[PDB]
Amino acid sequence: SKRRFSSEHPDPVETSIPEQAAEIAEELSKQHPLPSEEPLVHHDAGEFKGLQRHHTSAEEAQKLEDGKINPFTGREFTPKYVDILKIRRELPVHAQRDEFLKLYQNNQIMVFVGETGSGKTTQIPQFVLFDEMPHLENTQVACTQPRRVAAMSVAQRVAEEMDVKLGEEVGYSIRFENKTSNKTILKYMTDGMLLREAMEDHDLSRYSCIILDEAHERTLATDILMGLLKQVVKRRPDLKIIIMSATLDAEKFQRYFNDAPLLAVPGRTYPVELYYTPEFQRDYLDSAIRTVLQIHATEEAGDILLFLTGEDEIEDAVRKISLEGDQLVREEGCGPLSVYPLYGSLPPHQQQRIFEPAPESHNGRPGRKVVISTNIAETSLTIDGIVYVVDPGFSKQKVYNPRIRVESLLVSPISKASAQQRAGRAGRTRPGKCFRLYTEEAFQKELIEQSYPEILRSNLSSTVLELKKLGIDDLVHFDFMDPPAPETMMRALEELNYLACLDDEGNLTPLGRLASQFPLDPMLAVMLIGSFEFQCSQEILTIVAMLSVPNVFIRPTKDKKRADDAKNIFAHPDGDHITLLNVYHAFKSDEAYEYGIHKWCRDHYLNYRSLSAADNIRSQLERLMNRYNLELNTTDYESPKYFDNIRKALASGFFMQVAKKRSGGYITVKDNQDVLIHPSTVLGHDAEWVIYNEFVLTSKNYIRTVTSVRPEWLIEIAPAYYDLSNFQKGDVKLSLERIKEKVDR
Numbered sequence: 001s002k003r004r005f006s007s008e009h010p011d012p013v014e015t016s017i018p019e020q021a022a023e024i025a026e027e028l029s030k031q032h033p034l035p036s037e038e039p040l041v042h043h044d045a046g047e048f049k050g051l052q053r054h055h056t057s058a059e060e061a062q063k064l065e066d067g068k069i070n071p072f073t074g075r076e077f078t079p080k081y082v083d084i085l086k087i088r089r090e091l092p093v094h095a096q097r098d099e100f101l102k103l104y105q106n107n108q109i110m111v112f113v114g115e116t117g118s119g120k121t122t123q124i125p126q127f128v129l130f131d132e133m134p135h136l137e138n139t140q141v142a143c144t145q146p147r148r149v150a151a152m153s154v155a156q157r158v159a160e161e162m163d164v165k166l167g168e169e170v171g172y173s174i175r176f177e178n179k180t181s182n183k184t185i186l187k188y189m190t191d192g193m194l195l196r197e198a199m200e201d202h203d204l205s206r207y208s209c210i211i212l213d214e215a216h217e218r219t220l221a222t223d224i225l226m227g228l229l230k231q232v233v234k235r236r237p238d239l240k241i242i243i244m245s246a247t248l249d250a251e252k253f254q255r256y257f258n259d260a261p262l263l264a265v266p267g268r269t270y271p272v273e274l275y276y277t278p279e280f281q282r283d284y285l286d287s288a289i290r291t292v293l294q295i296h297a298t299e300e301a302g303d304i305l306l307f308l309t310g311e312d313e314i315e316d317a318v319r320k321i322s323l324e325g326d327q328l329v330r331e332e333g334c335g336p337l338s339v340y341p342l343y344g345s346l347p348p349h350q351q352q353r354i355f356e357p358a359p360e361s362h363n364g365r366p367g368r369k370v371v372i373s374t375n376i377a378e379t380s381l382t383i384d385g386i387v388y389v390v391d392p393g394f395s396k397q398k399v400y401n402p403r404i405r406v407e408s409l410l411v412s413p414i415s416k417a418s419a420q421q422r423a424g425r426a427g428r429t430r431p432g433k434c435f436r437l438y439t440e441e442a443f444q445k446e447l448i449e450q451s452y453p454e455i456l457r458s459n460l461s462s463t464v465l466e467l468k469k470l471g472i473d474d475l476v477h478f479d480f481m482d483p484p485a486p487e488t489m490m491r492a493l494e495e496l497n498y499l500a501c502l503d504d505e506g507n508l509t510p511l512g513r514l515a516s517q518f519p520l521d522p523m524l525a526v527m528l529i530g531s532f533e534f535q536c537s538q539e540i541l542t543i544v545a546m547l548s549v550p551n552v553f554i555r556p557t558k559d560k561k562r563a564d565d566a567k568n569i570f571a572h573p574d575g576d577h578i579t580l581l582n583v584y585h586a587f588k589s590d591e592a593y594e595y596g597i598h599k600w601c602r603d604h605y606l607n608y609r610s611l612s613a614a615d616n617i618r619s620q621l622e623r624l625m626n627r628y629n630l631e632l633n634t635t636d637y638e639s640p641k642y643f644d645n646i647r648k649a650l651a652s653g654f655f656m657q658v659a660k661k662r663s664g665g666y667i668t669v670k671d672n673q674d675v676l677i678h679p680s681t682v683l684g685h686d687a688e689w690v691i692y693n694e695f696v697l698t699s700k701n702y703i704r705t706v707t708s709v710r711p712e713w714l715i716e717i718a719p720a721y722y723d724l725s726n727f728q729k730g731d732v733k734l735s736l737e738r739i740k741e742k743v744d745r
């Protein structure tokens with residue numbers, strides 16, 4: 001039965017200021033509807049006309065590959081393309097090309113498996129390109145990666161293998177980063193971005209083929225896509241699906257996909273000699289740095305791959321190994337050593353540096369390359385020439401606390417499966433070694449078998465809003481390969497209801513529809529959309545962007561005081577959200593430009609990469625707001641309302657993340673949890689009530705990135721949530737009781 005709404009228990013949708021803005025912006029759009037997406041263009045000079053769709057063979061394709069003229073363009077192949085072509089034809093998948101094609105042609109859905117390095121991601125989409133000829137039938141081919149870096153990098157690679165401009169025929173699409181055009185045939189993308197394209201077009205009519213790659217990682221977006229496409233095939237007989245996975249046990253995938261056929265590529269990997277440590281290593285970084293240097297000194301030629309858990313850690317490791325590395329060249333006469341980082345946030349031109357050849361030695365002692373990388377180097381891509389792996393046995397993983405309902409990112413021990421995959425990378429070129437910084441005992445006993453799929457480790461808030469935009473009604477019976485606890489799904493509906501993205505009946509509100517057009521956490525989108533109603537859109541727009549990137553402040557452990565002093569320039573007391581607005585404003589100042597920008601960031605102890613990212617994110621966000629008719633406005637700084645309005649917008653999205661100061665530490669509105677402010681910030685005596693961006697649990701529980709807020713404002717902005725009937729007795733409800741009555745006449 002329909003829920004009743006009163007002044008005592010209002011409708012969260014009607015009381016949502018963001019909802020108002022959405023309704024306003026929605027109508028502005030109806031005065032000028034948007035044009036339909038720009039069409040695709042291609043080239044036919046008749047190069048393919050000798051080929052018949054879904055009847056093609058490997059030989060028929062070779063002749064075209066071996067022809068003068070690039071069939072997809074009409075221009076002629078470059079001499080480097082021919083060199084590359086010989087190399088890539090030595091990959092294992094090329095032996096099975098006709099076997100693969102025969103399955104592609106006779107089936108809608110198929111499973112593909114092979115060791116990392118078999119040539120799945122780079123080749124198979126090109127195989128499909130020749131048999132499908134999607135540009136002739138006015139379609140594309142999509143290939144999804146769980147990882148940003150894997151998508152961008154491999155797209156750069158395959159563009160060269162097809163001898164085409166990046167962004168023209170071969171292109172890539174990432175969140176806030178897009179290289180594509182009307183010319184694009186083969187599009188490598190993150191599984192998240194394909195999911196978003198599906199939200200706008202449910203049938204994905206632009207793609208005659210969809211390749212879900214690296215399924216074994218079983219990321220949240222991949223699992224959803226598998227669920228969708230399993231339906232789409234019914235509406236679309238003209239669509240073909242390929243599921244690629246690195247694990248040879250795919251039987252579960254076959255059943256889920258309705259007993260689809262399996263193609264397996266046999267392992268070509270060489271033997272890898274495993275080395276363990278005699279006892280537990282408490283500090284693995286120094287253990288790792290030493291192992292690398294040991295190898296470079298004592299071992300025969302070949303390149304080293306080091307697995308670490310994050311950028312700051314990796315950049316720190318690049319520093320030390322570069323330093324001690326240069327010392328051995330000078331002191332001990334070692335061969336030269338090159339050192340490259342790899343992690344998620346890296347720019348593309350920095351990404352591609354890992355493939356550079358090892359330096360040539362003049363000392364008669366081998367020159368070498370060491371790549372310090374995250375789990376990206378586990379299955380997602382391969383670096384030619386790696387004979388040596390160093391495995392500290394840690395990765396940055398998402399954990400979930402269903403009781404508290406909180407997502408945390410923590411460095412934690414890897415699965416046994418991951419350890420095997422890491423070691424396997426040393427045996428590609430020839431026999432090689434893998435040095436594990438744990439004990440053979442720990443590897444068998446302590447490490448777990450496999451990591452649970454992300455769907456089980458996530459809060460489903462964004463997942464739910466995505467599903468509803470896709471037209472899914474019953475979210476419990478949705479076809480997930482591994483269903484989440486239904487309790488988690490029900491919580492997400494509540495939260496999105498309070499955010500006024502959904503009504504009490506579960507239907508999308510105008511806010512929800514608009515919020516889904518932004519690639520942000522629902523809290524961030526709501527905050528951003530309703531921002532102009534609080535007359536600070538320009539400032540909130542900046543703050544969302546800053547929140548979309550890592551902490552920009554650099555605080556070396558030895559240099560702490562100077563770094564803190566540098567930060568207090570931008571620091572706003574009880575303003576951590578406002579601090580973010582200050583650095584970005586400082587970052588874009590004409591003053592920092594004259595100073596020189598990279599030097600400015602370094603001297604002020606700020607990270608240029610993070611701030612550069614935010615700048616791009618902000619631009620991409622501003623573009624969405626102009627498109628969907630969200631007004632850009634700002635209040636004069638001298639105004640008494642200036643900081644109030646920002647705090648109001650912030651509360652509008654984040655009102656469910658709030659804490660009140662203990663009378664007799666802090667208590668959180670939701671769940672009534674005792675917490676402490678993160679040491680990274682101190683608060684004055686005037687902040688009884690604060691909004692926090694982050695819940696951080698290490699032993700004791702912290703809230704980070706905090707900004708004070710007046711509890712009155714909470715009642716005004718979110719009256720449905722702060723309805724006292726929802727609260728249980730405690731310091732929190734009593735205090736709330738008193739703010740209510742004190743509103744008089």
Ligand SMILES: Nc1ccn([C@@H]2O[C@H](COP(=O)(O)OP(=O)(O)O)[C@@H](O)[C@H]2O)c(=O)n1
Nearest residue numbers: 116117118119120121122153154157381384
């Ligand atoms: N991002 C990438 C991925 C692969 N490659 C090259 O392409 C070969 C591996 O092909 P692949 O990535 O398609 O193999 P799979 O892991 O997909 O099965 C290797 O010889 C790599 O050197 C590259 O240069 N850059």
Ligand SMILES: [Mg+2]
Nearest residue numbers: 120121380381
């Ligand atoms: Mg691959």
Ligand code: NI
Nearest residue numbers: 474476477486
């Ligand atoms: Ni049921």
